[PDB]
Amino acid sequence: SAKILCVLYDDPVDGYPKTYARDDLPKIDHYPGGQTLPTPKAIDFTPGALLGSVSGELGLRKYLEANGHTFVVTSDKDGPDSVFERELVDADVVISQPFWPAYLTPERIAKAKNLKLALTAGIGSDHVDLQSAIDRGITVAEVTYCNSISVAEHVVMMILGLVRNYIPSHDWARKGGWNIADCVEHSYDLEGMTVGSVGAGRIGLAVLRRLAPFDVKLHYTQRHRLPEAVEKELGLVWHDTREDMYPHCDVVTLNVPLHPETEHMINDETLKLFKRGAYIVNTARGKLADRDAIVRAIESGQLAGYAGDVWFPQPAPKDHPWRTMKWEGMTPHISGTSLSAQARYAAGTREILECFFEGRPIRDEYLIVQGGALAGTGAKV
Amino acid sequence: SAKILCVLYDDPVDGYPKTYARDDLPKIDHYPGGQTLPTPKAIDFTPGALLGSVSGELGLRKYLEANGHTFVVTSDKDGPDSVFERELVDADVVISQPFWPAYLTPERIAKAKNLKLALTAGIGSDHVDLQSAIDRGITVAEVTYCNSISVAEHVVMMILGLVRNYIPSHDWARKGGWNIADCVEHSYDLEGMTVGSVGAGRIGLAVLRRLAPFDVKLHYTQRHRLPEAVEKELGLVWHDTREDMYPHCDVVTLNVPLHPETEHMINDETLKLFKRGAYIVNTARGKLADRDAIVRAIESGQLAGYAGDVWFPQPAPKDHPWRTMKWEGMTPHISGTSLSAQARYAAGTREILECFFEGRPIRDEYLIVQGGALAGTGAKV
Ligand SMILES: NC(=O)c1ccc[n+]([C@@H]2O[C@H](COP(=O)([O-])OP(=O)(O)OC[C@H]3O[C@@H](n4cnc5c(N)ncnc54)[C@H](OP(=O)(O)O)[C@@H]3O)[C@@H](O)[C@H]2O)c1
Ligand SMILES: NC(=O)c1ccc[n+]([C@@H]2O[C@H](COP(=O)([O-])OP(=O)(O)OC[C@H]3O[C@@H](n4cnc5c(N)ncnc54)[C@H](OP(=O)(O)O)[C@@H]3O)[C@@H](O)[C@H]2O)c1
Numbered sequence: 001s002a003k004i005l006c007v008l009y010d011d012p013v014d015g016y017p018k019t020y021a022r023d024d025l026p027k028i029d030h031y032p033g034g035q036t037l038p039t040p041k042a043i044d045f046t047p048g049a050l051l052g053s054v055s056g057e058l059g060l061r062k063y064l065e066a067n068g069h070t071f072v073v074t075s076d077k078d079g080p081d082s083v084f085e086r087e088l089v090d091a092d093v094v095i096s097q098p099f100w101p102a103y104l105t106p107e108r109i110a111k112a113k114n115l116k117l118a119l120t121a122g123i124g125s126d127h128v129d130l131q132s133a134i135d136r137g138i139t140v141a142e143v144t145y146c147n148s149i150s151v152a153e154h155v156v157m158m159i160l161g162l163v164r165n166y167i168p169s170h171d172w173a174r175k176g177g178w179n180i181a182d183c184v185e186h187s188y189d190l191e192g193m194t195v196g197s198v199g200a201g202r203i204g205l206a207v208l209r210r211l212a213p214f215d216v217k218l219h220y221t222q223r224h225r226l227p228e229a230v231e232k233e234l235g236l237v238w239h240d241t242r243e244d245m246y247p248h249c250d251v252v253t254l255n256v257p258l259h260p261e262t263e264h265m266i267n268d269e270t271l272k273l274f275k276r277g278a279y280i281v282n283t284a285r286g287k288l289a290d291r292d293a294i295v296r297a298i299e300s301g302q303l304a305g306y307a308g309d310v311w312f313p314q315p316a317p318k319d320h321p322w323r324t325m326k327w328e329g330m331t332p333h334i335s336g337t338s339l340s341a342q343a344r345y346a347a348g349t350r351e352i353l354e355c356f357f358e359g360r361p362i363r364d365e366y367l368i369v370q371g372g373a374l375a376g377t378g379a380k381v
Numbered sequence: 382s383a384k385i386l387c388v389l390y391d392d393p394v395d396g397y398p399k400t401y402a403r404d405d406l407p408k409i410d411h412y413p414g415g416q417t418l419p420t421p422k423a424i425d426f427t428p429g430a431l432l433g434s435v436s437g438e439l440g441l442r443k444y445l446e447a448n449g450h451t452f453v454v455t456s457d458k459d460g461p462d463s464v465f466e467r468e469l470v471d472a473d474v475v476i477s478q479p480f481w482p483a484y485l486t487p488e489r490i491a492k493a494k495n496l497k498l499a500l501t502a503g504i505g506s507d508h509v510d511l512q513s514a515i516d517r518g519i520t521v522a523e524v525t526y527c528n529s530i531s532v533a534e535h536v537v538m539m540i541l542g543l544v545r546n547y548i549p550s551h552d553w554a555r556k557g558g559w560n561i562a563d564c565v566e567h568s569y570d571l572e573g574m575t576v577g578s579v580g581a582g583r584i585g586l587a588v589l590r591r592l593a594p595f596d597v598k599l600h601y602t603q604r605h606r607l608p609e610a611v612e613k614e615l616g617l618v619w620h621d622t623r624e625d626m627y628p629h630c631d632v633v634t635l636n637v638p639l640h641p642e643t644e645h646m647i648n649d650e651t652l653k654l655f656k657r658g659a660y661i662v663n664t665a666r667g668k669l670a671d672r673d674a675i676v677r678a679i680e681s682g683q684l685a686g687y688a689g690d691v692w693f694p695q696p697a698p699k700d701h702p703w704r705t706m707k708w709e710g711m712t713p714h715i716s717g718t719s720l721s722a723q724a725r726y727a728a729g730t731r732e733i734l735e736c737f738f739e740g741r742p743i744r745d746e747y748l749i750v751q752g753g754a755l756a757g758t759g760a761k762v
Binding site: 056161164165182213304318328 | 400402403530535546559565572574595596704705710711
């Protein structure tokens with residue numbers, strides 16, 4: 001009946017794990033600010049398992065097949081001949097994660113005659129073309145706050161890694177060297193620097209709370225300013241615009257969604273506004289930053305470092321210039337798919353599927369598109 | 382007259398820097414808790430310069446030769462035929478940095494007929510044999526607090542780096558891969574975990590303040606408990622002994638000096654007390670952890686990661702097992718010699734020399750051994 005097409009990334013090359021490094025995941029009561037953790041009616045997995053790969057199946061097979069649904073799992077997602085595009089024509093639901101995203105391009109949504117729900121197992125639905133989903137009445141949902149703390153932790157890690165020159169230094173240790181001067185001729189403390197966040201949402205504000213005790217000057221921007229109390233707790237400095245903020249910052253971190261208003265906000269023009277030796281960490285989306293502008297700004301010294309886990313095209317080509325540029329601290333798109341995060345957004349995925357199929361309302365936090373218009377968290381993009 | 386022997390690390394392999402990545406270091410007013418930054422009569426360098434390598438000379442040659450002292454700088458420090466051992470015979474002062482340490486072994490202190498001051502440009506004087514210094518009336522001093530905050534940043538960066546599996550993931554990025562499942566089959570959030578510090582000194586407490594907003598549970602141990610007032614601010618949980626603390630901790634960080642009571646405090650015996658999949662970050666000294674005990678603990682799964690910048694011997698042999706073990710996030714000893722940190726301990730170095738040669742007292746907080754007994758900070762070992 002209702003076909004669920006599920007696009008997950010490949011198992012590890014040495015095989016799906018028969019052992020994890022630890023015996024249980026920490027208990028998270030609620031998210032900061034009070035949003036409750038996902039509330040499926042049950043879960044068919046043990047928290048800490050690898051839920052996000054083809055063998056993990058997000059703990060959904062037994063649930064869906066119990067309610068008579070077809071459940072198709074694949075990692076083959078790129079191309080017109082891919083298993084995704086072939087099973088897409090009559091799928092009722094599509095689930096994919098931003099880390100290995102099933103791109104729902106305009107022509108693919110055109111092919112998906114039966115599609116009623118496009119479900120982002122994670123946060124951020126920029127791989128689903130909103131224009132078509134709004135036009136065609138498809139519902140688009142995501143698991144709000146599932147990995148925001150995971151990404152916030154990754155962000156602070158990469159800031160410190162860039163300022164202190166971690167990645168090149170570790171190369172010297174693994175390669176048999178010592179080379180103190182080679183490591184530290186590009187190594188600074190973060191202490192006292194000015195850090196600016198584009199976006200003080202769930203990730204952005206979590207980053208700012210975590211940076212406060214490093215004795216840094218915290219600046220931020222977005223469309224709607226935060227309440228003074230919050231600004232004063234952390235000592236935040238507000239800016240109407242991004243461009244007003246960049247010249248102040250030793251470090252800039254990006255923490256906004258990807259839609260047209262924010263695409264290529266970091267480019268050859270805006271990059272001129274940064275101090276010399278500025279650092280950028282982008283854990284939001286790759287297309288927020290003009291790819292080759294970052295490279296050129298690295299090669300010229302405008303930037304002393306770039307780091308992130310987000311790229312475009314998500315499965316970044318082996319030749320992607322960010323992989324080999326100087327002063328890079330990049331990782332694949334992994335921040336939001338830590339084993340701790342997977343436990344939450346796999347339950348959230350199930351909560352949404354239960355709500356969708358039982359005729360119960362999908363959390364307003366979760367909603368991006370519903371009933372042919374933006375809805376819930378999507379209306380606030 | 383009066384010879385000052387100074388051991389510094391080599392210049393970068395591609396040459397001493399002419400163009401630095403940034404234009405200026407942030408201005409730090411005082412250290413946390415109120416200790417004033419170093420107070421020399423002048424500095425003959427620009428903060429942000431590379432003062433710790435042989436060409437930097439810690440900004441000391443012009444000062445020293447102005448007052449008639451001989452000034453000898455070398456990086457050749459290990460071996461009986463080394464320039465350091467052949468110049469130590471009649472040196473009145475010896476300066477070396479922990480990151481490239483001139484080991485003042487008992488046999489070398491015996492040959493040092495004119496030695497009166499052993500100045501640690503940094504923190505931790507374990508490269509100088511304490512017993513011989515006490516027996517011989519030599520003064521031993523270090524620039525307390527000069528890079529305690531720098532190390533606190535390195536620790537939190539390496540905790541996150543280990544828990545989240547940063548280094549192996551970056552290898553997947555630089556090598557042309559994607560391999561999400563390979564990265565995250567060993568990646569967790571830090572949120573909610575329990576972190577324990579051995580030592581809540583200048584580094585330890587700075588680490589604990591920085592970990593608070595990560596929503597981790599914070600434990601600590603040392604010989605003397607901290608004021609509950611402070612304990613209640615960070616929500617610290619106190620433990621009488623280390624062995625009492627280890628079973629609770631998902632992460633343990635070592636932040637104590639190297640003495641007999643702390644040497645090899647992590648060994649095949651105590652490691653049995655750790656949770657499976659525990660993380661250790663050691664930015665204190667290499668000999669706090671039995672080298673092969675760590676390796677064995679990694680291979681068995683007792684530890685899910687080991688990271689630090691401190692090893693033994695330093696310089697670490699190319700075959701050091703910590704450089705190639707699984708789940709390692711090592712860097713050479715660089716935390717305390719970031720360009721920001723060098724500016725401070727090069728000034729402190731000059732302050733102490735001025736105090737020493739002018740007959741003015743060295744600050745109590747700088748003193749380790751003086752006049753045949755432990756002194757100042759060294760009295761608190
Ligand atoms: N694993 C990963 O790498 C990963 C994981 C999760 C999310 N992400 C990315 O991070 C983004 C943010 O996540 P989050 O949980 O922090 O989201 P959120 O709670 O929706 O916060 C988004 C923030 O963007 C700000 N913003 C500033 N300019 C904006 C603009 N022009 N359009 C829209 N928003 C703008 C918003 O403030 P105002 O709109 O009020 O100005 C808001 O503070 C996601 O949408 C996704 O793209 C990445
Ligand atoms: N990697 C680097 O670049 C770098 C840089 C600076 C320092 N370090 C290392 O880090 C060490 C600590 O630095 P710091 O600035 O935090 O020093 P500190 O201010 O002297 O603090 C040392 C701490 O160790 C605690 N401690 C616990 N057990 C101890 C024992 N058995 N004996 C002595 N002290 C004990 C002390 O508290 P109690 O007295 O109550 O026990 C104290 O809080 C240095 O000595 C050095 O070895 C490394």
